[PDB]
A paper describes a structure:
We examined three globular proteins from three phylogenetically disparate sources including: FtsZ, the cell division protein from B. subtilis; NS5B, the RNA-dependent RNA polymerase from Hepatitis C Virus; and P38α, a human protein kinase. Based on this analysis we defined a truncated form of B. subtilis FtsZ spanning residues Ala12-Ile316 (termed "FtsZ truncated").
Not surprisingly, the sulfate ion forms non-bonded contacts with residues in the T1 and T4 loops. The sulfate ion is positioned in a nearly identical manner as that observed in a recently published full length Bacillus FtsZ structure.
Numbering used by the authors:
A (entry chain A), B (entry chain A): 12 to 315
Amino acid sequence: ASIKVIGVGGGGNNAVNRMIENEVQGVEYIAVNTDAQALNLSKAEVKMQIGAKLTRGLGAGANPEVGKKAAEESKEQIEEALKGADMVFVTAGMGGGTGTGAAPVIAQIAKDLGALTVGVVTRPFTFEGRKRQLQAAGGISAMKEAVDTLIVIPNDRILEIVDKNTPMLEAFREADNVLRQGVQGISDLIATPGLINLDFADVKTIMSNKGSALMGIGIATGENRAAEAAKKAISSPLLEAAIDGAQGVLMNITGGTNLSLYEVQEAADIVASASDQDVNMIFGSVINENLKDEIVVTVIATGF
Amino acid sequence: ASIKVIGVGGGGNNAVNRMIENEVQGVEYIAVNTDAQALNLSKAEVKMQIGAKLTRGLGAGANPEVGKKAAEESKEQIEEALKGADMVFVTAGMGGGTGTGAAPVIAQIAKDLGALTVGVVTRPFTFEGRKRQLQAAGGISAMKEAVDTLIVIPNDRILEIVDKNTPMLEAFREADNVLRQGVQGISDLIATPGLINLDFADVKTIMSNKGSALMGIGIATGENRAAEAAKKAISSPLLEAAIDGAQGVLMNITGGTNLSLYEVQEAADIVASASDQDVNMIFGSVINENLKDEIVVTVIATGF
């Protein structure tokens, strides 16, 4: 499949950088921004400055209507960058001017090109202030109408996972990495050979015109790791609701070379038992040799 | 010498990235910003978020007084990052909130630590608008009082050099690269073995408490290249004034392996003839093997 990951605005650009840094296979990267400096820091080969006439490379401020207009200014160039894609991941931090306003435009473009369009976006941390929070909710509504499936990750839940003395800059970097795992959790199953892959059509049945979706991540080491990562994924603080409310579930279990098929099934089993009995569930597994005795379960719940 | 290059705000962060990309030797990189996304895109090992309480990682807006206050919030951490430096290059695009306001604070910190403090900053392009232009001039005055030498590069002059159809995003990337060449033109002579190096004390005599400075860059290929690069450097559109107004001049001539000592002298000679008869002039040369038949002359004129 031709898969494109388009990172919109600061947060989205960082997610794309995290993916490049982690050598995610089988995807093309596009970095999009109204801020030319941010964009020139991007490791992506395709760097798309949007709303050059409107913003002059200076960014959108915090106004999402400016981000929207900048994307509208650059419709034709966004179209050209996305032509040929079978699947487009639109990734963004919601709350600011560019992500919140430009991401929904770009998602709708991807859709109008016939791509399976998956949004993977964050709600901002509470410490970013109340206006960012409200703007984000508006962007999330707008995104919902423009994508096939929209994964929303609340950044405040990251803080319930990480060390309480995690500095602000590292908290932001953790959110980039969650966005990365939301994209890569799906993509790797279609596009990276591992232990169990999925056909694009399986993923599509789960994501196509489904609306709201959630993500849980579970990490565990050593004995009982498969059961524990699974139980941790399905109870992840990242989950805004329980996965039994979902029409579809996708599970990715990623491990090192000691990951076994019976471990994958036992994770799958736990996830299936947690899901609706009439869920459509699919799952796969890939190997990352940097992992030793710890595995990672990522669960995407679609169609709430 | 312990040399630190501290890039402040978007433009400054990009300059530091350009240096890292070009494997500049013998310097430590610090990336500084109020915008946590930009900063997390930086390739520098030391990433310093300033004004975390004041700005929440959201940036300074376009208000330089916010950049100033953010730096003031983080004085202690800026001090800790700069301790031990013999020379500090503070690099920034002037015009916006963070560079314009934070850079002068950081320069004065470097000075109060005993560093030879060289500012290398740009005036913004006219297309960035009139307010950015005015703010920039204010920042440049503020910087002048805080550094030993302040190199100012007008971005609009880049446009007189590059192709008229150069896209906006690439114009910005060209300004980053000019800032890079202003830093690296000095640093390489002290810190990278080549054909003729300078002692730190020579450079210091030229830069210390000198105030305003200018830069010219000349590039030429093949026959007569040394004479031509030199004549092009001394007549560079980047120069806001003629170099004969300077108390000091530094020349760096960089070439591939066919660069000769007699070529270096003949460049030096041209630059000396263009300078005041009572200039203090110093010069050096280094080799970059990616250069074939083209050489690069960079001239820094100090003490106007």
